[PDB]
């Protein structure tokens, strides 16, 4: 478990520094303009809270999953938009001035909608209630290591736009070093993950959920005829999820032996999400080159 605590601390520092780097690409005026007249934000919220949990429900019903496995899929589905989308949307020149709005409003709306969707969906899968085990002190606390670095980044750019360099290179160097450290800390647990006989249905579900998220986001954006960058921004916000709540919910609700192999599910979700995001990024950059 000390490895888990070290991973959490290194990941918190990772988020802090990467968002300090990322906060240089937006301005407060554009944030205000995009927050007003909520067109893109409404579509992103409707997507993330009506088509990703419904996809979780239908996919769990159709793949013939257990009660606990279906519960894990549902909890990952209902989770708020992750902070991975902020980093990813830069890789295809998405409207970064709107991805922050999406992430913040998604977290705030999750704080009060996750129990509602969980109660509406887990009927027949869970005997008790899930409106009591959702960590409300973590949803609103995960938002701080995102807003604080971004806010100091925009303040640095707007007030003193001469320290643009130097800090960027130092942040990239420390990010690379801590990423190598996390790789070392994770390769020792991937072995136990593969030793555990995770059912191939769950691997298929974790690989196929983000793909459906991305494609349904793109289709939804195309239906309402959004812009160019905003289309990719919504189509990749609606697919990235914060699966660090699934582990907490499962640990609180069920004994450590009932979840079993599902304790490694968030790592699998992250690795498949990274793989699919990077594949899409490479495809889009190749498209832009031609």
């Amino acid at each position, epitope marked *: 478990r000390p*490895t888990d605590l070290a991973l959490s601390i290194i990941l918190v520092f990772m988020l802090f520094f990467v968002m300090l780097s990322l906060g240089c690409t937006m301005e407060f005026s554009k944030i205000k303009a995009h927050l007003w007249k909520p067109k893109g934000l409404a579509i992103a919220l409707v997507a993330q809270y009506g088509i990703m949990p419904l996809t979780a429900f239908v996919l769990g019903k159709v793949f013939q999953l*257990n009660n606990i496995e279906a519960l894990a899929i549902l909890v990952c589905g209902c989770s708020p938009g992750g902070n991975l989308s902020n980093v990813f949307s830069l890789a295809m020149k998405g409207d970064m001035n709107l991805s922050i709005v999406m992430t913040t409003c998604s977290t705030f709306c999750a704080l009060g909608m996750m129990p509602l969707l969980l109660y509406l969906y887990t009927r027949g899968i869970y005997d008790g209630d899930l409106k009591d085990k959702v960590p409300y002190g973590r949803i609103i606390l995960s938002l701080v290591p995102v807003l604080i670095p971004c806010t100091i980044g925009i303040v640095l750019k707007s007030k003193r736009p001469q320290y643009m360099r130097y800090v960027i290179k130092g942040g990239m160097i420390i990010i690379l070093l801590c990423s190598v450290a996390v790789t070392v800390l994770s390769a020792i647990n991937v072995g136990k993950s593969i030793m555990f006989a995770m059912t191939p249905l769950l691997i298929a579900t974790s690989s196929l959920m983000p793909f459906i998220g991305f494609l349904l986001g793109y289709v939804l954006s195309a239906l309402f005829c959004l812009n160019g960058r905003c289309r990719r921004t919504v189509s990749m916000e609606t697919g990235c999820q914060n699966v660090q709540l699934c582990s907490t919910i499962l640990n609180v609700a069920f004994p450590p*032996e009932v979840i079993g192999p599902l304790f490694f599910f968030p790592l699998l979700y992250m690795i498949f999400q990274l793989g699919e995001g990077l594949l899409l990024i490479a495809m889009f950059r190749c498209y832009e080159k031609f």
Partner: antibody
Framework: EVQLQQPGAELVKPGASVKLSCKTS????????MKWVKQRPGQGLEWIGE????????NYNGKFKSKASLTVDKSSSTAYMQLSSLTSEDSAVYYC???????????????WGLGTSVTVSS | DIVMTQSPAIMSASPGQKVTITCSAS?????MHWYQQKLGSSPKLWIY???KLALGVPARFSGSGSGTSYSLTISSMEAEDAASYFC?????????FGGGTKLEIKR
């Protein structure tokens, strides 16, 4: 050493209520779930319910939801049960179990109580 | 709920011959765990996740199978193994134990 202490036997009257205690010592009481198992002589084991001492959340069996009420008291480390409105077919042996389980280094180990032989006298 | 049809209910065996106990679930179960209860004692975990061994169980025991048919195999039976074995699953609530087989010793 881990030890779970249970009363040897309890005597009741039909239609009455009884409280079963499972005093645990030698380990921190608020980490492992406490599972209650009922064994009727002549049948297999039946699972009754769980309870997380540090949180209070419980999961019951389908047919024991209206007969069992698991409760804990972390100050005394004592996990309780309250069978209600006993019948002639409730005469059995009730065990309290904790299961150690982890995935970092895979291993498991059970710690069972001695069983509280509950019978209906009349 | 998943019911278990564990057969045979009563088994006769010899100290040195291989014996097998089959637990036949009535629905798809991922993992099946076996409990051993001796004479006048609380059952203790014996084999969990259908192939692994608990702490203290001798290495002779072994479980196999997947789907809705799990088996427990003893390579070389000894006189200390005469007890009752229950198959137990916790992957789909409520947890349901099997009917149990009474393993004896022949002479």
């Amino acid at each position: 050493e881990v030890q779970l202490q249970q009363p040897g036997a309890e005597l009741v009257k039909p239609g009455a209520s009884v409280k079963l205690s499972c005093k645990t010592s030698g380990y921190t009481f608020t980490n492992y779930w406490m599972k209650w198992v009922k064994q009727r002589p002549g049948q297999g084991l039946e699972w009754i319910g769980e309870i997380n001492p540090s949180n209070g959340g419980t999961n019951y069996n389908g047919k024991f939801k209206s007969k069992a009420s698991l409760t804990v008291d972390k100050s005394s480390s004592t996990a309780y049960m309250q069978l209600s409105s006993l019948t002639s077919e409730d005469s059995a042996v009730y065990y309290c179990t904790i299961l150690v389980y982890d995935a970092y280094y895979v291993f498991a180990m059970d710690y069972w109580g001695l069983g509280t032989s509950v019978t209906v006298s009349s | 709920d998943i019911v278990m049809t564990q057969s045979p209910a009563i088994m006769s065996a010899s100290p040195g011959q291989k014996v097998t106990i089959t637990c036949s679930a009535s629905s798809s179960v991922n993992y099946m765990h076996w409990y051993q209860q001796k004479l006048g004692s609380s059952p203790k975990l014996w084999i969990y996740d259908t192939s692994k061994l608990a702490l203290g169980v001798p290495a002779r025991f072994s479980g196999s199978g997947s789907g809705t048919s799990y088996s427990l195999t003893i390579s070389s039976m000894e006189a200390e193994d005469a007890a009752s074995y229950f198959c137990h699953q916790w992957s789909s609530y409520p947890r349901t134990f099997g009917g149990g087989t009474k393993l004896e010793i022949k002479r």
